[PDB]
Amino acid sequence: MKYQSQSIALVYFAVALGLFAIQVSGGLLLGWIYVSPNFLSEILPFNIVRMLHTNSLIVWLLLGFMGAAYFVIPEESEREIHSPLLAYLQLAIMVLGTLGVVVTYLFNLFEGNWLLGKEGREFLEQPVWVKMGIVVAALIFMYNISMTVLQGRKTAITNVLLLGLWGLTLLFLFAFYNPSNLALDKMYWWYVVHLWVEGTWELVMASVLAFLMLKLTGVDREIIEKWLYLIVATALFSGILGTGHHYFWIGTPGYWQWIGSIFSALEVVPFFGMMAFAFVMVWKGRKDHPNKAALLWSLGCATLAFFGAGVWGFLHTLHGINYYTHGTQITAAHGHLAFFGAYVSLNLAIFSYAFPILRKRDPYNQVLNMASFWLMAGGMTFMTFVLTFAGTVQTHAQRVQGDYFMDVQDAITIFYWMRFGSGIAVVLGALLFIYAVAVPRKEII
Amino acid sequence: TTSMARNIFYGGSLFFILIFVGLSVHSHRYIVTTSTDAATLTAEVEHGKHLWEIHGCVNCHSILGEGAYFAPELGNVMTRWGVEDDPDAAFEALKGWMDAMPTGIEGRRQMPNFGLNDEEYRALSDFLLWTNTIRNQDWPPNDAG
């Protein structure tokens, strides 16, 4: 550490990792319900488990970003954080919020209540008190890190990061606008989901990936920060209009089929940018950094995000294909690999970098940490292959041939067992990473 | 050339935000006036959307191809049931189905029962119908969802 407040990041990572373990176990369960549909079919129905799989994903990824912000800000701003008390109060709000969500979904508390009961759109089912909690927590967060940059050194890393983070926060406000008109509802719903993941969150991914490469390779500011601004340019140029790929079939105008389909293809540019950025910086820079694992997650992140977000994205992004594959298992395959490479791996890469620093010791459990990456990445891409096949069989069987939903699903049972199996790998993988980060032991040879 | 890349970024981004906000304002109006029928967006249809929401159908089903992938697309269930032009038969068809869930069938995916009254079934029926009329570029490809 250079600054003592950088250890707040360790509490954030701790909770986030706690929540990461719940998230994949939620996934495994969902997978198992797919092959064994009668399981807990009255106490824990699929839609309940799903909310839990998806929300804990959003919440833990955010805590990852918050944690990462509390680590990366003081280091770049050359000063201590404006107020530790705010950081802890922020995280307490978060933990309270995330507890309320778990307990509300499970037991169906206050069904119907405008403020206390669950809402009901994808990823935005949080009782409105929790949504409020998140905003209050986010604002506190934004105030706190902003003051720390204002009063310290400003750099390109810090700027992109603050933008992405500010944009992320403010776009969350759209989660409050729930128009009685389904088409309108769907249109502003993507302001949250897509302008997060392909907009604001992309800034955060690139700026943190900048900071990573900066430290692991030892290439200098000016080379890193050039590439930074270039990458995030191509992202916002393609990302914002590319929102139109979600505007094909929801009742928006026909013109989005063109705008959207074109700007979508351009979205593979920044994900290629980052993959190459990561690979050159390495080849180009110092190669003896002790933190072998934070390196691997970093390349892993930029690479899988390219295959996940870029290629599999492109694959179903043109309306000609999308007409057929929309709302299908194909969608499920993109989303998993895209989320894993761009955001999970990125959080895991930054966790692997800061844990040793935070514990003041040498990169530890490197073989284990790295084994967790192969096991999670291995199992994750295998899952996405298997769901592509399945989605192809579906798309054909139901969208060209016209066979009925349920019947077609009996046809792809084998693929669902294969996903479930691949899930065992991801869960084992994720636990091992937690272990590797949480329990330093004698290194493996 | 770093300060250039910065300026391309800050400036060229702002450009595309504007275009997007313009485009959205158009699209918002296209939705309200042309692609969805305001007149048929009754109090029941709102109450239907709300029911849809609080019971969490979207986390098993998809609607206009958005949601979960566990159960049939319901954006067009009313057409699938040859019942789209008949509000009373739709209500009847929906009530009959929902009353029957859960099937309990071994090895088959399960839908809960929400304890819905008939005013409520009507709300859902009316909303799914109203959804079926959203002018959305001929999606889906057929009746199967």
Ligand code: HEC
């Ligand atoms: C998962 C735990 C479910 C939730 C929550 C909801 N539904 Fe559902 N639904 C589900 C399954 C597994 C099936 C297929 C059942 C079968 O035996 O084939 C369905 C089916 C319907 C249908 C018939 C659609 C069709 O066959 O094409 C309708 C009209 C329907 N479901 C409506 C509906 C509504 C209004 C819901 C929220 C209030 C809802 N479902 C939730 C599983 C699940």
Ligand code: HEM
């Ligand atoms: C951070 C990167 C990205 C992540 C995490 C991500 C994730 C997702 C998720 C989860 C969905 C489904 C949303 C839902 O539940 O309805 C989705 C939809 C989609 N994404 Fe991405 N995405 C990313 C970037 C991209 C890119 C770069 C492309 C390139 C074209 C792309 C193409 C698509 C398409 C076409 C759909 C809609 C699929 C359909 O209509 O069924 N995405 N994305």
Ligand code: HEM
């Ligand atoms: C542990 C293994 C996992 C399994 C078995 C699994 C399984 C599933 C299942 C069954 C769904 C519901 C899909 C549907 O509606 O049909 C789902 C949704 C989702 N999962 Fe996972 N999951 C796993 C891990 C992950 C991971 C690591 C991520 C990324 C963080 C992730 C992100 C998602 C997302 C974003 C959705 C919403 C998908 C959408 O609407 O497109 N899951 N998961």
Ligand SMILES: [Ca+2]
């Ligand atoms: Ca979905």
Ligand SMILES: [Cu+2]
């Ligand atoms: Cu009513």
Ligand SMILES: [Fe+3]
């Ligand atoms: Fe998108």
